[PDB]
């Protein structure tokens, strides 16, 4: 019900200004704040304090205080976030990079 109310509220703020945003967008935000089991805020406290990657969390607001703690807790960043691969300058695992591309010598020798 917390989710349903939270959406209702978000929806009102948009529609009050006489604007339309498709459900899904507001739904997703509402869901993300929800999933944890409570009301996880879109603040340095809420989301940024979850189990995501340390470089990711550090790219928003708490930077150095996040990397010191990352050090003493011996965190391990699995580099699945977009933030990490951007810091690292590698092709992010998003759309175009969400899959891999291989040559097949079978199909290759078939066409000639």
């Amino acid at each position: 019900a917390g989710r349903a109310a939270l959406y209702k509220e978000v929806y009102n703020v948009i529609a009050s200004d006489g604007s339309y945003v498709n459900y899904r967008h507001m739904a997703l935000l509402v869901d993300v704040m929800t999933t944890q089991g409570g009301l996880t805020s879109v603040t340095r406290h809420g989301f940024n304090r979850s189990n995501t990657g340390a470089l990711m969390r550090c790219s928003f607001e708490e930077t150095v205080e996040i990397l010191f703690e990352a050090g003493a807790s011996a965190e391990l960043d699995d580099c699945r976030g977009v933030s990490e691969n951007v810091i690292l300058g590698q092709m992010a695992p998003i759309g175009t990079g969400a899959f891999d591309v291989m040559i097949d010598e079978e199909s290759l020798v078939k066409y000639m």
């Binding site: 899959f99 891999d100 591309v101 291989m102 097949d104 010598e105």
Partner: protein, 84 residues
């Protein structure tokens, strides 16, 4: 671990991203003087060559589609439906 062809469950259709990446990759390879698997009917732009190769499904590439767990389903460009 790699999902068997008989147990594949991802879309039989090629994603916008897949197609954009295949066309990008082939065009890149074509441009790096890679062998072209189609009659260039006067074509000179590697993307227009790539488009042509994909149009006749003569692109020898495979999409390794990763699942959130780490497993994957491999799909041939020849076998993917291009409704885009």
């Amino acid at each position: 671990k790699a999902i068997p062809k008989d147990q594949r469950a991802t879309t039989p259709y090629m994603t916008k991203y897949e197609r954009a990446r295949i066309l990008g990759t082939r065009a890149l390879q074509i441009s790096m003087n890679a062998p072209v698997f189609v009659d260039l009917e006067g074509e000179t732009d590697p993307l227009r060559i790539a488009m042509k190769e994909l149009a006749e499904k003569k692109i020898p590439l495979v999409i390794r589609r990763y699942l959130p767990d780490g497993s994957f389903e491999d799909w041939s460009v020849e076998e993917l439906i291009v409704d885009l």
